[PDB]
Amino acid sequence: XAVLX
Amino acid sequence: XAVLX
Amino acid sequence: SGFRKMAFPSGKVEGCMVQVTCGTTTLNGLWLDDVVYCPRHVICTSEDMLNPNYEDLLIRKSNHNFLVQAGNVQLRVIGHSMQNCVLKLKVDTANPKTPKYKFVRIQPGQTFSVLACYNGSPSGVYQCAMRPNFTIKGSFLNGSCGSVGFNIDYDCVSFCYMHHMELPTGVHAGTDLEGNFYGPFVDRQTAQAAGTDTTITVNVLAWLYAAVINGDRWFLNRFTTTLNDFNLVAMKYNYEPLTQDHVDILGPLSAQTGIAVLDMCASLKELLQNGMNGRTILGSALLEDEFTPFDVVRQCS
Amino acid sequence: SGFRKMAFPSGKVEGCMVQVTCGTTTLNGLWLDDVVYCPRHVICTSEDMLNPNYEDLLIRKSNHNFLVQAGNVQLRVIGHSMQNCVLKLKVDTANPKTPKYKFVRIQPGQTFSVLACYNGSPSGVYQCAMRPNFTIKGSFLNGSCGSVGFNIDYDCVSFCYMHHMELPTGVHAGTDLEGNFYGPFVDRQTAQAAGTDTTITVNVLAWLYAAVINGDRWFLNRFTTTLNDFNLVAMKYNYEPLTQDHVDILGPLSAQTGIAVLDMCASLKELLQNGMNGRTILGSALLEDEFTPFDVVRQCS
């Protein structure tokens, strides 16, 4: 997982 | 030697 | 003397930071003239985040769906558009603190300052390099998106980075100020990974020159090398190939210290093969690669 | 996530930097309300510098001997006085950009941001710790004197350092904003040396906690230790004794990570005795000691 800030 | 800035 | 990982003074960028809220989502925006720039995922909710269709989410919004807060004041949004992964909100007031500025898309290996911000309020400032794999090793928490990275030249701010996301390895990804990602990344919470990184060879060499300028010389030797033999060693240690362009860029430092570029490459080669053996360079026990030659010249003068 | 050596945003201090010229000597000053603070050796020439009598040099000056430049404007000096090693120039105009501010004298081991300035113009910003021997490892060139160090709390600037000189070891010495030197140093170009430095143990421990917060855990162990046995090891490695005050200050971090303070001391003990063996912590191959526990809590949140 990419995690959007 | 100290050197003053 | 002394050599520090130095950031640009951040005040000219502090004057530009605002809060953008859409629905329940709040992040930071950059207010320049009468436009606020921010990451487009501000129009997302948490379950839109696996695979959003941003065009769909945005066609369902109007100007009054967006709240911009500049410290005390609320700014009325009078227009909105999407450019790649950024939202552009046209507001009814030009930022009176707008600096002279440019938008720049930087090359890997270049450095910049990041102003970490939360809810429109600057938290801290630190120096970063764009890694060869187009991530940055930053310090970012929830709410930091829309924080920007920049260089300052004379008194013109060149904005080069806006923060969007964190990859599973703890590194960070974002866009230029036109909303184009650095690297292959996309703004969705899918499985993405950075490519294999490498060490920025020209920067390591520049920092060895900084060391010499500041009187760290234990790592020099009487040897030299050719560009090709050095590059054989560099490939072996996951360093980027050294181009003659890089060698030329190192010209002025070589000239100030009187150490030929390829002589410093021979020193780097033996540092790679032998290690440091308990010694440090400029207070580091690792070979540092987030100073460009221009950073070294600027700070050492 | 991520952990960087982060400085405070510098804009509130940038608004305060001015140029002070006396005769042929130019350095930086800090303009707060209607007073400019600067190092007193601005009233020196280069051959007054081995053993100046500052009272003599100053009684021979008048208000019009001092020129203060704030960007474009010249500020008329209407009074002048000496307080320890700083000059206070009363000017006819209150700084419209004066932040909420305090002057603080910090303890060794505390950290602060430095805004490096030349001719009244900020150059860069970086984070520093006051070393146990009351020097700082800064980055300062000719003309940087009068550059200040500060912390920001909410939106109040606590000024704690003004830069005066460089010792032969390449480290730096200066005063609080009342002009009292940190350490035994004096503002003359005589033979002076820093005392033997030590490593700030509580800060190393705080940074190990930062590492754990960020997922670097290879250095933990199942062991523990007493404060006294740990301190025996620390003395052996030129680390500062760890006080129960320090252990308590580490309370909140211990609580967030669930690692008892003395357990982390056992990890530090084996790091000191074994080294890192080719591994890094938060991108460092050395044990870092310029993050206070409060720095770690602030940045990791």
Measured CA to CA, the distance from residue D43 to residue D52 in angstroms comes to 10
Pair type for strands C66-70 and C17-22: antiparallel
Measured CA to CA, the distance from residue C182 to residue C194 in angstroms comes to 11
**Amino acid present at D109:** G
- Helix extents (H) in D22-180: 54-59
From B2's Cα to the closest Cα of chain D, the distance in A is 5
10 Å CB burial of residue C236 (0-12, 13-18, 19+) is exposed
Q: Do D285 and C286 touch (CB under 8 A)?
A: yes
The tokens for C263 are 């002589």
Buried b (16+ CB within 10 A) or exposed e, C160-174: bbbbbbbbeebbbbb
The catalytic residue among C38, C145, C160, C265 is C145
Measured CA to CA, the distance from residue C170 to residue C8 in angstroms comes to 24
CA-wise closest residue to D124 among C233, C229, C301, C174 = C301
Using DSSP's 3-state secondary structure scheme, residue D146 falls into coil
Does chain A touch chain B (at least 3 C-beta pairs within 8 Å)?
no
Taking one residue from A and the other from C, the number of pairs with CB-CB distance under 8 angstroms is 42
Q: Do D285 and C283 touch (CB under 8 A)?
A: no
Interface of B with D (CB under 8 A): 1-5
Method of determination used here: X-ray
Half-sphere exposure of C80 (CA within 13 A, CB side): 24
Measured CA to CA, the distance from residue D300 to residue D31 in angstroms comes to 34
Cβ atoms of D16 and D27 within 8 Å: the answer is no
Measured CA to CA, the distance from residue D66 to residue D54 in angstroms comes to 15
Measured CA to CA, the distance from residue D296 to residue C119 in angstroms comes to 20
Measured CA to CA, the distance from residue D141 to residue D126 in angstroms comes to 15
DSSP letter assigned to residue D7: B
The catalytic residue among C16, C22, C41, C265 is C41
CA-wise closest residue to C131 among C111, C154, C159 = C111
The tokens for D269 are 């003990």
- The length of chain A in residues reads 5
Cβ atoms of C290 and C113 within 8 Å: the answer is no
DSSP letter assigned to residue D199: B
Q: Do D4 and C126 touch (CB under 8 A)?
A: yes
Give the CA distances from residue A2 to residues A5, C178, D17, D53, in Å, rounded to whole numbers and listed in that order: 9, 21, 42, 64
**Amino acid present at C164:** H
Q: How far is CA D31 from the centre of its chain?
A: 19
Contacts 24+ apart (CB under 8 A), C214-221: C214/C1, C214/C2, C214/C3, C214/C282, C214/C300, C214/D170, C215/C1, C215/D170, C216/C281, C216/C282, C218/C279, C219/C267, C219/C270, C219/C271, C219/C279, C219/C281, C220/C259, C220/C263, C220/C264, C220/C267, C221/C263, C221/C266, C221/C267, C221/C270
**Amino acid present at C6:** M
CA-wise closest residue to D80 among D93, D92, D91 = D91
Closest residue, chain B, to D166 (C-alpha): B3
> Which string of DSSP letters, residue by residue, matches chain C?
------BPP-HHHHTTEEEEEETTEEEEEEEETTEEEEEGGGG--GGGSSS--HHHHHHT--GGGEEEEETTEEEPEEEEEEETTEEEEEESS--TTPPEEEE--PPTT-EEEEEEEETTEEEEEEEEE--TTS-B-----TT-TT-EEEEEETTEEEEEEEEEEE-TTS-EEEE-TTSPBSSS--SSSS---PPPP-B-HHHHHHHHHHHHHTT--TT--S----HHHHHHHHHHTTBPPPPHHHHHHTHHHHHHHT--HHHHHHHHHHHHHH--TT--BTTBSS------HHHHHHHH-
The CA dihedral of C271, C273, C277, C280, to the nearest 10 degrees, is 20
Q: Domain boundaries in chain D?
A: 1-14+100-197, 15-99, 198-301
| Backbone φ and ψ of C82, nearest 5° | -115, 135
CA-wise closest residue to D110 among D288, D294, D247 = D294
* Chain A residues within an 8 Å CB radius of C192: 1-2
Q: Which site among D139, D212, D279, D291 would you substitute to test the C interface, given the most C Cβ atoms closer than 10 Å to its Cβ?
A: D139
What are C45's strand-pairing partners? none
Measured CA to CA, the distance from residue D26 to residue D22 in angstroms comes to 7
Q: Resolution of this PDB entry, in A?
A: 1.7
Half-sphere exposure of C210 (CA within 13 A, CB side): 30
Pair type for strands D156-166 and D100-103: parallel
The tokens for D179 are 């002009």
State the angle between helix axes of C261-274 and C227-236 in degrees (0 to 180), rounded to the nearest 10: 30
10 Å CB burial of residue C1 (0-12, 13-18, 19+) is middle
Buried b (16+ CB within 10 A) or exposed e, D79-90: ebebeebbbbbe
In chain A, which residues are last before a break of more than 2.5 Å from C to the next N?
A: none
Cβ atoms of C131 and C174 within 8 Å: the answer is no
The CA dihedral of C249, C255, C256, C258, to the nearest 10 degrees, is 130
Measured CA to CA, the distance from residue C50 to residue C52 in angstroms comes to 6
Measured CA to CA, the distance from residue D24 to residue C111 in angstroms comes to 37
Write the Ramachandran bin of D31: left for phi over 0, alpha for psi from -120 to 50, otherwise beta: beta
Measured CA to CA, the distance from residue C294 to residue C282 in angstroms comes to 17
Measured CA to CA, the distance from residue D132 to residue C224 in angstroms comes to 41
CA-wise closest residue to D297 among D204, D200, D201, D213 = D213
CATH number given to D198-301: 1.10.1840.10
Q: Do D170 and C2 touch (CB under 8 A)?
A: yes
Which positions of D are annotated as active-site residues? 41, 145
> Which string of DSSP letters, residue by residue, matches D202-214?
HHHHHHHHHHHHT
Handedness of CA C30, C35, C40, C42 (dihedral sign): positive
Give the CA distances from residue C104 to residues C107, D149, D255, D292, in Å, rounded to whole numbers and listed in that order: 10, 31, 44, 36
Measured CA to CA, the distance from residue D204 to residue D135 in angstroms comes to 18
CATH number given to C1-14+100-197: 2.40.10.10
Give the CA distances from residue C295 to residues C107, C110, D8, in Å, rounded to whole numbers and listed in that order: 15, 10, 20
Q: How far apart are the first and last CA of chain D?
A: 10
Measured CA to CA, the distance from residue C224 to residue C254 in angstroms comes to 14
CA-wise closest residue to D219 among D162, D179, D264 = D264
| Backbone φ and ψ of C249, nearest 5° | -55, -30
Answer yes or no: same fold for C1-14+100-197 and C15-99: yes
10 Å CB burial of residue D279 (0-12, 13-18, 19+) is exposed
Half-sphere exposure of D76 (CA within 13 A, CB side): 3
State the CATH architecture for C15-99: Beta Barrel (2.40)
The tokens for D3 are 């952990």
The tokens for D35 are 């007073």
Give the CA distances from residue D283 to residues C212, D4, D12, D247, in Å, rounded to whole numbers and listed in that order: 23, 9, 31, 25
Measured CA to CA, the distance from residue D271 to residue D287 in angstroms comes to 9
Q: Do A2 and C172 touch (CB under 8 A)?
A: no
From C36's Cα to the closest Cα of chain A, the distance in A is 18
Half-sphere exposure of B2 (CA within 13 A, CB side): 22
Half-sphere exposure of D21 (CA within 13 A, CB side): 12
